[PDB]
């Protein structure tokens, strides 16, 4: 290690690093190699977290770290202390590009494909999800960018399940996702097994998975403008949606023009927050 500074003992190197700030730390990290690795040392962050934990005057429900019995115990006898530093620092927001599981009968019964419309929408910059994680055994999903700001990812499940019945790959999706999208068929001619769909929704929205009160956007959807529509108040009321007691919204939608989608998506993003 030709650098006088790189050769020092790690104990002593971290001690030096203890007087810096996260911003500094990133510049030093950008020297690459070791420094990038070591600037992120779990131990340095424990020290920072323990220090400065006692300097913060707010703690929301979404940010109170696991047992302080666990945050504050023997170094070895968790992490990513850096990540935990971030959630707890009340002046810092960790970053996230929401992902949503889109399933529903509406994806296949409508004579115009919604999915194939979302895919051909100049306005949302749909682009193949990068293998960079984002993979599962279902694909990377499709990234979209709402009016050049909020980016999000949708995993379109064309077949969910085989009572529960949630397929296993699908449960990996149910846990890592932030919200759900259910594409109901609002076309007035369609006969429904409301109870089935409600069950099927539930099955997927199951709290044993990613628990939380993850929002459910349901797209009351029809092929195009001229098709006679079931009003959404009545649709919402047929799927028994009153029972889910966790955020939901039924947004009317047209496969062809995507009329209504953009309002619906805006709602789901704003719902997921921290």
């Amino acid at each position: 290690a030709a650098s006088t500074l790189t050769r020092l003992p790690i104990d002593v190197q971290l001690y030096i690093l203890s007087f810096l700030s996260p911003h500094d730390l990133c510049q030093l990290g950008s020297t690459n190699h070791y420094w990038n690795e070591t600037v992120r040392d779990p131990i340095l962050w424990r020290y920072f977290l323990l220090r400065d934990l006692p300097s913060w005057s707010s703690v929301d429900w979404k940010s109170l770290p696991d047992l302080e019995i666990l945050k504050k115990p023997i170094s070895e006898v968790f992490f990513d202390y850096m990540a935990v530093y971030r959630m707890c620092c009340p002046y810092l927001i960790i970053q996230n590009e929401p992902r949503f599981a889109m399933f529903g009968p509406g994806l296949e019964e409508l004579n115009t494909s919604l999915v194939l419309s979302l895919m051909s929408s100049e306005e949302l910059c749909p682009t193949a999800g990068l293998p960079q994680r984002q993979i599962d055994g279902i694909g990377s999903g499709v990234n979209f960018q709402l009016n050049n700001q909020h980016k999000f990812n949708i995993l379109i499940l064309y077949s969910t399940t085989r009572r529960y019945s949630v397929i296993p790959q699908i449960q990996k999706v149910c846990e890592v996702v932030d919200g759900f999208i259910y594409v109901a068929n609002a076309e007035a001619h369609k006969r429904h097994e409301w109870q089935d769909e409600f069950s099927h929704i539930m099955a997927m929205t199951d709290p044993a998975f990613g628990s939380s009160g993850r929002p459910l956007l349901v797209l009351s959807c029809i092929s195009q403008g001229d098709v006679k529509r079931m009003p959404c108040f009545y649709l919402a009321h047929e799927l028994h949606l009153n029972l889910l007691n966790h955020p939901w919204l039924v947004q009317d939608t047209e496969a062809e023009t995507l009329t209504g989608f953009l309002n619906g998506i805006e709602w789901i993003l704003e719902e997921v927050e921290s």
Partner: protein, 145 residues
């Protein structure tokens, strides 16, 4: 109250006992055996001479520095050659003198603050080592909000 300190190459240094105990590393050897001369196999003479100067200056005060502004005198004391600075950083660590460690490490820290790196890079002779594309990936990843 006089104690013998033996450099890494013998050398002198007859310091007052309170001044030597200031290094825990020493205080604990003085309790192993009588230890008359005191062998310090890591610290040379040049450095130990500095170390004694620093200790004799702070003898009558210790407590609570940490992230307190480096005092004016220490600032001068430390206007030394870079390699010499790190040599102090090691003596402090070897002799376990917390105050000297605080102030030497903090001065090193203050050098890194506010650099590109490319400055941080020149300053400490550190190996670039990110291949062509390696950069952006660490540079976007190391943009602390």
């Amino acid at each position: 109250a006089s104690i013998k300190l033996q450099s890494s190459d013998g050398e002198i240094f007859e310091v007052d006992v309170e001044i030597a105990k200031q290094s825990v590393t020493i205080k604990t050897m003085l309790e192993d055996l009588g230890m008359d001369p005191v062998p310090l196999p890591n610290v040379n003479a040049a450095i130990l001479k500095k170390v004694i100067q620093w200790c004799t200056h702070h003898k009558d005060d210790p407590g609570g520095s940490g992230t307190d502004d480096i005092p004016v005198w220490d600032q001068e004391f430390l206007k030394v050659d870079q390699g010499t600075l790190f040599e102090l950083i090691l003596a402090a660590n070897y002799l376990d003198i917390k105050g000297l460690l605080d102030v030497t490490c903090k001065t090193v820290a203050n050098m890194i603050k506010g650099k590109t790196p490319e400055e941080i890079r020149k300053t400490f002779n550190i190996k670039n080592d990110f291949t062509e594309e390696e950069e952006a990936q660490v540079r976007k990843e190391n943009q602390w909000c």
